[PDB]
Amino acid sequence: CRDLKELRHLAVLNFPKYCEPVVKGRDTRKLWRNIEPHLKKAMQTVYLRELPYYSKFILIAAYLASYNPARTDKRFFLKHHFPLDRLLAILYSIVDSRVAPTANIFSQITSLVTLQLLTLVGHDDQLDGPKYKCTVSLDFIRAIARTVNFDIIKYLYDFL
Amino acid sequence: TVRQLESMIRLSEAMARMHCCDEVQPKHVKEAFRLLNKSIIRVETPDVNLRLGFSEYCRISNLIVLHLRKVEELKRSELVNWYLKEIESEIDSEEELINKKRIIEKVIHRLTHYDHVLIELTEDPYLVVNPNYL
Amino acid sequence: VGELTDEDVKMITSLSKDQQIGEKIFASIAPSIYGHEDIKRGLALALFGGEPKNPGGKHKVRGDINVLLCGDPGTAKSQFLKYIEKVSSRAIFTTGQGASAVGLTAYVQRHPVSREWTLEAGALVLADRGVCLIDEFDKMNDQDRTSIHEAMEQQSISISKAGIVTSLQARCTVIAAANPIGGRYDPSLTFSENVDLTEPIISRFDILCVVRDTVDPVQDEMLARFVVGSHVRHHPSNKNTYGVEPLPQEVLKKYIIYAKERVHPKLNQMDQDKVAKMYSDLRKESMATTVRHIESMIRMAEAHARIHLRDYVIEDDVNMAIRVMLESFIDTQKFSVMRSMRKTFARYLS
Amino acid sequence: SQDLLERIRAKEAQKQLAQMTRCPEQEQRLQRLERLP
Numbered sequence: 018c019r020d021l022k023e024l025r026h027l028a029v030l031n032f033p034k035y036c037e038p039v040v041k042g043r044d045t046r047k048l049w050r051n052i053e054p055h056l057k058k059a060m061q062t063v064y065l066r067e068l069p070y071y072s073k074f075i076l077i078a079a080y081l082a083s084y085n086p087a088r089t090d091k092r093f094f095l096k097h098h099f100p101l102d103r104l105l106a107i108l109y110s111i112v113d114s115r116v117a118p119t120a121n122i123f124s125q126i127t128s129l130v131t132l133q134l135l136t137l138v139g140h141d142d143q144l145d146g147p148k149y150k151c152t153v154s155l156d157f158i159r160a161i162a163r164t165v166n167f168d169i170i171k172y173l174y175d176f177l
Numbered sequence: 178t179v180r181q182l183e184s185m186i187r188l189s190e191a192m193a194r195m196h197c198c199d200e201v202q203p204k205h206v207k208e209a210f211r212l213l214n215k216s217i218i219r220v221e222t223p224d225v226n227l228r229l230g231f232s233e234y235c236r237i238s239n240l241i242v243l244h245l246r247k248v249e250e251l252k253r254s255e256l257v258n259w260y261l262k263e264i265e266s267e268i269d270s271e272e273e274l275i276n277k278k279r280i281i282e283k284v285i286h287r288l289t290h291y292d293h294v295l296i297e298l299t300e301d302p303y304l305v306v307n308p309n310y311l
Numbered sequence: 312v313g314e315l316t317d318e319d320v321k322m323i324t325s326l327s328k329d330q331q332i333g334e335k336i337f338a339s340i341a342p343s344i345y346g347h348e349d350i351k352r353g354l355a356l357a358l359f360g361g362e363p364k365n366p367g368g369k370h371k372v373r374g375d376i377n378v379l380l381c382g383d384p385g386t387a388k389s390q391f392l393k394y395i396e397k398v399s400s401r402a403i404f405t406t407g408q409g410a411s412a413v414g415l416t417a418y419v420q421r422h423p424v425s426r427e428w429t430l431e432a433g434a435l436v437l438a439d440r441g442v443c444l445i446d447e448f449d450k451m452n453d454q455d456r457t458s459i460h461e462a463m464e465q466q467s468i469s470i471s472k473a474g475i476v477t478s479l480q481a482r483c484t485v486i487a488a489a490n491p492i493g494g495r496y497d498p499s500l501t502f503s504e505n506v507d508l509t510e511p512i513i514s515r516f517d518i519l520c521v522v523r524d525t526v527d528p529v530q531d532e533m534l535a536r537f538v539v540g541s542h543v544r545h546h547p548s549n550k551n552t553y554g555v556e557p558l559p560q561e562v563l564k565k566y567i568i569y570a571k572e573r574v575h576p577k578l579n580q581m582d583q584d585k586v587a588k589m590y591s592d593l594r595k596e597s598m599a600t601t602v603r604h605i606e607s608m609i610r611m612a613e614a615h616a617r618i619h620l621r622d623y624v625i626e627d628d629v630n631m632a633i634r635v636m637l638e639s640f641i642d643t644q645k646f647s648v649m650r651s652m653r654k655t656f657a658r659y660l661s
Numbered sequence: 662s663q664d665l666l667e668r669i670r671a672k673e674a675q676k677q678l679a680q681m682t683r684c685p686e687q688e689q690r691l692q693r694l695e696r697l698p
C-alpha cells in the first residue's frame with residue numbers, strides 16, 4: 018500500500034488501539050509487543066475493508082457440468098462400461114433419492130439464474146435449448162460439498 | 178515415500194562416518210535435508226553486491242533472524258558483537274575481521290532498507306524482525 | 312509330527328484356549344511393518360490352508376487359497392513376500408522376469424549320459440504341499456500365463472511331450488504380486504482395467520487385495536515413528552493395532568505345523584438359507600455392475616476353524632469369512648458404486 | 662578481548678611460518694628414511 022489516502026485511513030482507524038497500552042499503564046518494546054498481532058490481523062485485509070437443500074445439489078451439478086468435459090460424463094456416472102438435459106441427468110444420477118420433476122425445481126433454477134450464480138448464454142426467447150455457465154469459486158463449492166457430505170474432488174476429471 | 182526416509186537415514190549415517198563420529202548428530206540431518214530438497218540446480222548462483230554469494234546471504238539472514246527470534250523470548254552493536262563472537266572460529270587475520278565487519282554492516286543495512294525483513298525502532302537503533310518472516 | 316516335543320503340544324493347546332488367539336496370531340505376522348491389517352489377515356488365512364476334498368472321486372474341490380496383491384509402489388509388498396518365504400517350512404521364491412513357462416513347470420530333457428527322456432521338475436512341482444511366490448506377476452507373458460490356469464484349477468499338471476504323457480501333483484498355495492499399469496491405481500476404473508491380466512486369471516484367485524497411497528498426516532507420523540524405532544532396534548551394534556503381544560516365530564511355526572497336521576473341521580452347522588440369500592444378492596449386485604466364490608468362502612471358513620483348532624466349525628467362522636470376502640469384493644469396484652454396496656451390506660460389515 | 666587473542670594467534674602463526682621456512686625436502690627424506698628398510 019503506497020496510496021497516501023489509504024495509508025492515512027488505516028492509520029486513523031488503528032490509532033485508538035495504538036494508544037491503549039499507555040493509557041492502561043515511551044516504552045517501545047512494550048507497545049510493539051502489545052500491538053504486533055493487531056497489525057498482522059489488520060494486514061490480513063489490506064484493500065478489503067445457507068442455501069436450500071436441492072439448491073446445493075443443483076449448484077454442484079452445474080459446477081460438474083461446466084468444468085468436466087462431456088466425453089467423461091458416463092465414465093463418472095454410468096454404472097457399467099452445457100445443455101439442460103445433461104444437468105438433469107447428472108442431478109438424477111447424484112441424488113440417492115428419487116426426485117419428482119416438480120415446478121419448484123425449475124423455480125429454483127430461475128432463482129439461481131437471477132442471483133447471478135448461473136449465467137444464461139443463449140437467447141432469452143429460446144427456452145427449450147438453454148445454455149448455462151457456472152461462476153462459483155472452487156473453495157465455495159468445496160465448502161458446500163463438505164456441508165452436504167459429498168466428495169467433489171473424486172469426480173473432477175481435471176484433478177484426476 | 179518411506180524410501181526417502183530410509184535415504185535420509187542413510188545420508189545422516191554417511192555424514193557421521195565421514196566425520197569419524199561414533200554417534201549421529203542433528204547437524205548431519207540438517208545438512209542432508211538441503212541436499213534432499215534442492216532437486217533442480219543451476220551451474221552457479223550469480224553474485225550479489227566486493228561481491229557475495231546467494232547461499233552465504235541466505236545463511237547470514239537465517240542466522241540473524243534465528244538469533245533475534247530466540248532473544249524475543251536487541252541493539253545493532255550488540256548483535257554485531259555476537260556475530261563476530263560466533264564466527265571467531267573461522268577468522269584468522271585482522272583483514273578478515275575487518276572484511277567480516279564490512280560484510281555484516283552492509284547486509285544488515287540491506288535487509289533494513291531493501292528486503293524489509295528488519296524494522297528500525299528509535300547511534301544504536303533497535304532492530305526487530307518483520308512478523309511475517311518464517 | 313513325530314519329532315514334535317510334548318511341551319510344544321501343551322503350549323499349542325494352552326494357546327488354543329485363549330479367546331484372543333486370532334488377534335495375537337494376526338499381529339504376530341510382519342512386526343516390522345505398520346498397519347495393513349487386511350493384507351496380513353488374508354495372507355495368514357491362506358497360509359493356514361483349507362481342507363482339499365474329492366466329492367465322489369468324480370470332481371476334486373481344491374482346498375487351497377490363491378492370493379493376489381495389487382499395490383502402488385512404496386507399500387512393502389516385497390517385504391511381505393520375503394517374510395512369507397522365510398516363515399514357510401517349504402518355500403520357493405521366483406521373479407517375474409526370470410520365470411519362463413519351461414522353468415516353472417516340469418520339462419522333458421534327454422539325459423547327457425544315458426539319453427533317455429527324463430522329467431525335470433519346475434518350481435511349482437517342487438512347491439507341492441508348500442507355497443509358491445510370484446513377484447511382478449503383471450510382467451508374465453500371456454503364453455507363459457496359459458499353462459498356469461491348469462495347475463491353478465486342478466492342482467495337477469499333465470505333461471505330454473516327446474511321446475511321454477505323465478501326471479504330477481501341484482497342490483500348492485500361490486501368492487502373487489502386481490503393480491497397476493501406469494504405476495498408480497485409479498479408483499475411477501474397475502479392478503480388471505487397472506491390472507493387465509485376463510478375467511480367468513483373476514477368477515482363479517480367491518483373495519484380491521489392492522493397496523493405495525494416501526497423504527494422511529497422522530498416519531504419516533505413525534509410519535515415521537514406527538520405522539525409526541525399528542531402525543534403532545535392529546542396529547548390529549544394538550544387537551499394535553489389536554493391542555495384542557505377537558507370538559514367537561518358532562512358536563508360530565510349531566502352531567502352524569500342528570494345525571496343518573491335526574485339524575479336520577466339519578461344516579455340519581451351516582444355515583443354507585442365509586448364504587443362499589446372500590448369494591442371490593451377490594448375483595443381483597454383480598449383474599447390476601460364481602460357484603467358486605462360494606467354494607472359496609467355504610474353504611476360508613474351514614481355515615478359520617483350523618486356526619482355532621476346532622474339529623467342528625462355529626458360525627462365527629462363517630461370519631468372519633463373509634466379512635472379509637465382502638471387503639475384498641467391494642475393494643475391487645468403482646468408487647461410484649462401493650458406497651452403495653457398503654450401504655446395502657452394512658449388516659455384515661458392522 | 663577478541664582483538665588481543667587474534668593478534669596472539671597471528672604472532673604464533675608468523676612464528677610457526679618462520680619455523681617452516683626451512684626447506685620441506687629436509688623432512689621428506691626423513692619420511693622416506695623410515696620407508697627405506
Ligand SMILES: Nc1ncnc2c1ncn2[C@@H]1O[C@H](COP(=O)(O)OP(=O)(O)OP(O)(O)=S)[C@@H](O)[C@H]1O
Binds near residue numbers: 179345383387490534
Ligand atoms: N508401510 C511401511 N512400513 C514400514 N516400512 C515400509 C512401509 N512401506 C515401505 N517401507 C519400507 O520401504 C522399503 C522399500 O519398499 P518396497 O518393498 O521396495 O516397495 P514396494 O511397495 O514393494 O513397491 P515396489 O515393488 O518396490 S515398486 C521396505 O523395505 C521398507 O523398509
Ligand SMILES: [Mg+2]
Binds near residue numbers: 387388390
Ligand atoms: Mg516390492
